[PDB]
Amino acid sequence: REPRRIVIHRGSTGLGFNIVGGEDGEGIFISFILAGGPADLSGELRKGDQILSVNGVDLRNASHEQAAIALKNAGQTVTIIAQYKPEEY
């Protein structure tokens, strides 16, 4: 259950995933992976990954809005530290 570093590049549509959580002690979790999008084709992101950071910005205790912002401001090369945490998701 080690965390992993994933580097994805943004596409017209975006990074290709959605997130949930950010509240009540729940972290930011990947809820949806868009087929064929960058998150999908990383081969390293899954539904149920907790996003621990984005370009080094800690999102462990971040609100959903904070996390969305971080993903948008991360630019064209997005480095995600994710940890697969299905029990919690």
- Spatial separation of the C-alpha atoms in residues 59 and 13, rounded to whole Å: 23
Which method, experimentally, gave rise to this model? X-ray
**Cα–Cα dist 63/67, whole Å:** 6
48, 82 contact by CB (below 8 A): no
Cα 24 off chain centre by: 18
End-to-end CA gap in the chain: 14
